[PDB]
Scaffold this active site. Structure first.
Site, PDB file in Angstrom:
ATOM      1  N   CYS A  35      -7.026  21.748  -3.241  1.00 45.44           N
ATOM      2  CA  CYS A  35      -7.657  20.936  -2.215  1.00 45.44           C
ATOM      3  C   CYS A  35      -8.429  21.446  -1.065  1.00 45.44           C
ATOM      4  CB  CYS A  35      -6.442  19.909  -1.709  1.00 45.44           C
ATOM      5  SG  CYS A  35      -7.044  19.223  -0.057  1.00 45.44           S
ATOM      6  N   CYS A  44      -7.354  20.511   2.423  1.00 45.66           N
ATOM      7  CA  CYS A  44      -6.358  21.070   2.515  1.00 45.66           C
ATOM      8  C   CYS A  44      -6.188  22.595   2.951  1.00 45.66           C
ATOM      9  CB  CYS A  44      -5.340  21.070   1.249  1.00 45.66           C
ATOM     10  SG  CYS A  44      -4.965  19.398   0.685  1.00 45.66           S
TER      11      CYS A  44
END
Length: 105
Positions: free
Chosen positions: A32, A35
């Site tokens: 991600c 993230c």
């Protein structure tokens, strides 16, 4: 400091050990992008807010923890006091992360 939560039992143990402290849990993944962006900021926040507990859960490693927690978006931040979820949001928004800490501690 951030603690990586790597079993269901560990997650409960951390929530219990926090006493009345705010706990913030970052549900993330290695793949991600957003993230990865916010991870160093989550870590800096952990060094700043000494009386807030900062936890990380990897959703691929811990799929059932994430599922149980009704995670649907990457990343998700959940906030707990006394084991009770007091807040939650999704997405890698720095200001929203720190604002929510300052709303809920």
């Amino acid at each position: 400091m951030v603690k990586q939560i790597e079993s269901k039992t560990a997650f409960q143990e951390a929530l219990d050990a926090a006493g009345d402290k705010l706990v913030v849990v970052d549900f993330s993944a290695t793949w991600c992008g957003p993230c990865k962006m916010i991870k160093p900021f989550f870590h800096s926040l952990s060094e700043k807010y000494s009386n807030v507990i900062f936890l990380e859960v990897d959703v691929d490693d811990c799929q059932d923890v994430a599922s149980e927690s009704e995670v649907k978006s990457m990343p998700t931040f959940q906030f707990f006091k006394k084991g009770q979820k007091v807040g939650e949001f999704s997405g890698a928004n720095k200001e929203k992360l720190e604002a929510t800490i300052n709303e809920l501690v």
